[PDB]
Design an enzyme around this catalytic site. Structure first.
Site, short mmCIF file in Angstrom:
data_model
loop_
_atom_site.label_atom_id
_atom_site.label_comp_id
_atom_site.label_asym_id
_atom_site.label_seq_id
_atom_site.Cartn_x
_atom_site.Cartn_y
_atom_site.Cartn_z
N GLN A 36 42.01 29.87 30.32
CA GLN A 36 42.88 30.09 31.11
C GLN A 36 42.89 29.51 32.35
OE1 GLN A 36 44.01 34.71 30.39
NE2 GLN A 36 41.74 34.43 30.11
N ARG A 62 30.62 33.06 29.73
CA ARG A 62 31.87 33.18 30.56
C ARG A 62 31.45 32.45 32.04
NH1 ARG A 62 34.88 37.40 29.90
NH2 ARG A 62 35.37 37.65 32.17
N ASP A 72 33.16 52.38 35.35
CA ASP A 72 32.29 51.95 34.27
C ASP A 72 31.14 53.04 34.19
OD1 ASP A 72 33.87 49.71 33.64
OD2 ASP A 72 32.18 48.25 33.98
#
Ligand SMILES: Cc1cc2nc3c(=O)[nH]c(=O)nc-3n(C[C@H](O)[C@H](O)[C@H](O)COP(=O)(O)OP(=O)(O)OC[C@H]3O[C@@H](n4cnc5c(N)ncnc54)[C@H](O)[C@@H]3O)c2cc1C
Ligand SMILES: C[C@H]1CCN2C[C@]34Cc5c([nH]c6c7c(ccc56)OC(C)(C)C=C7)C(C)(C)[C@@H]3C[C@]12C(=O)N4
Length: 444
Positions: A228, A188, A312
């Site tokens: 995107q 990514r 997290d």
């Protein structure tokens, strides 16, 4: 007549939301962060309607106005096969009824950081927090600076929002459990918009992006790719879930090899088209992040009720699913609301009420997301065409993104108080009834 004193450890997305929520609700906040959180690092973060519901209240709408360039305008997800043919258009009309954001992580950090400074959150950067302790009357931490000096810092309770590699988790769960590799990883990155502009072979990616953000998904053998755009085509971002058995570390700083992405896609008809865009990723921005499965912790609150893990630190999700940041923002909002309803003389009750509101819901998102990247709905693409069966419906689940966590907390606070204090189980209705028992979620 003093204010509650909140210590926050870690200013990632959840620590900054915690700081803003607590300060907006009348509490004094001292937040601590070991690094320069303003450096550009990472790619894009998605915020669905359950998070933007919360953000909209900050500053009578100030943060929402600052984030307005990043409101998602995609009307559908376009699902393609390895030839590039469009198989299915999945409608986003109900998901986008209320605002969603998509934006670089560092731009989200900056907007929240500046708002937090404006409303009077006290921020200490360059501070590694360690050695937390607590009793029935208060909590403290050691603030360790880069020169080796130690400063004791006291407050009413500590919010541990120090991320997936949290060292504060020891203070609550002594023995650490190791997450299980899924056998999958995610390439990514952001694309460099300047060199992407000026490449004729990539011009196709800009079509429409000024009125409707791009949201293309491509299913290839061994790769699930999403592309995107956001903010009228000023930012493009992509990811690719692929098989990876390597012993990869789950951090955002390690350089990956772009040629591994290229080799994976160039062998299919649509590969050259996708690479014409993905090739404009800066060479040291390619991340290959392992998708690990973290089991829900047994509990989030310490023995004296003055430390809580939230983001997290409590419930890591892989970037594959799209609810990580959103769930962490719910943590901060439920905690701040709970602390407000309970008052300064009932802090431990406040933390235990917030954990009981959030635990089953967050564990369910966490457990479903395992079945998304350790398993998944990926078939043989020699025989099947992709469709909505192969799109992880988690961000499309109305019971996640339609939820109003502050309203729920206010309506249920006294019933949760009753369960905490009578020592009864609290059966929360902010997830589906069938789901808790199906996923094996045990109440705290
Ligand atoms: C540098 C970075 C880049 C990321 N990029 C992306 C991305 O592109 N896409 C994505 O989906 N997710 C990304 N994430 C993860 C994302 O922030 C989380 O998954 C989630 O959105 C919010 O989690 P969090 O706020 O609980 O923790 P995090 O975002 O991990 O924040 C934890 C923070 O705590 C700080 N900290 C840790 N220990 C201490 C300590 N002892 N004392 C003080 N401070 C401490 C860390 O420096 C960090 O700033 C990134 C995380 C980091 C740290
Ligand atoms: C593995 C990849 C392959 C393709 N992906 C699609 C997805 C669904 C989805 C995502 N984000 C979404 C958003 C959304 C609606 C649906 C989704 O609304 C908006 C408001 C537009 C914001 C985010 C992803 C996190 C990228 C996951 C992950 C993934 C998938 O199966 N389902």
């Amino acid at each position: 007549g003093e204010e509650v004193q909140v210590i926050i450890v870690g200013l990632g997305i959840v620590g900054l939301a915690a700081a803003i929520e607590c300060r907006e609700k009348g509490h004094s906040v001292h937040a601590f962060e070991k690094s320069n959180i303003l450096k550009s690092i990472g790619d894009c973060i998605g915020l669905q309607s359950n998070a933007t519901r919360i953000i909209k209240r900050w500053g009578d709408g100030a943060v929402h106005e600052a984030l307005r360039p990043w409101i998602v305008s995609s009307k559908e997800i376009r699902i393609h096969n390895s030839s590039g043919r469009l198989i299915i258009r999945q409608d986003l009309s109900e998901v986008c009824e209320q605002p969603n954001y998509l934006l670089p992580r560092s731009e989200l950090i900056r907007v929240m950081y500046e708002h937090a400074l404006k409303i009077g959150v006290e921020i200490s950067l360059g501070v590694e927090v360690c050695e937390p302790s607590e009793d029935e009357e208060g909590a403290s931490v050691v603030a360790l600076t880069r020169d080796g000096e130690r400063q004791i810092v006291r407050g009413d309770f500590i919010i541990c929002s120090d991320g997936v590699h949290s060292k504060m988790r020891k203070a609550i769960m002594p023995q650490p459990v190791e997450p299980r590799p899924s056998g999958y990883a995610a390439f990514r990155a952001l694309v460099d918009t300047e060199t992407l502009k000026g490449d004729p072979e990539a011009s196709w990616v800009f079509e429409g992006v000024e009125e409707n953000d791009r949201f293309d998904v491509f299913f290839l053998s061994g790769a699930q790719i999403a592309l995107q755009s956001c903010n009228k085509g000023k930012v493009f971002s992509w990811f690719c879930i692929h098989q990876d058995t390597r012993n990869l570390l789950d951090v955002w700083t390690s350089p990956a090899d772009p040629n591994e992405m290229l080799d994976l896609i160039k062998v299919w008809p649509i590969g050259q088209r996708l690479w014409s865009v993905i090739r404009h990723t800066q060479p040291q921005k390619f991340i290959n992040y392992p998708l690990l499965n973290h089991k829900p912790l047994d509990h989030w609150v310490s023995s004296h009720g003055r430390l809580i893990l939230i983001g997290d630190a409590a419930h890591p999700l892989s970037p594959a699913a799209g609810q990580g940041a959103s769930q962490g923002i719910e943590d901060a909002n439920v905690l701040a609301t709970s602390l407000s309803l309970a008052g300064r003389q009932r802090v431990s009750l406040a933390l235990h009420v917030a954990e009981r509101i959030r635990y089953a819901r967050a564990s369910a998102v966490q457990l479903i997301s395992h079945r998304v990247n350790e398993g998944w709905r990926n078939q043989d693409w020699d025989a099947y065409e992709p469709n909505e069966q192969n799109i992880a419906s988690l961000p499309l689940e109305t019971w996640i993104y339609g939820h109003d966590s502050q309203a729920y907390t206010e309506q249920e606070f006294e019933m949760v108080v009753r369960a905490v204090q009578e020592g009864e189980e609290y059966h929360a209705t902010n997830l589906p009834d069938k789901l808790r028992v199906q996923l094996g979620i045990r109440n705290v």
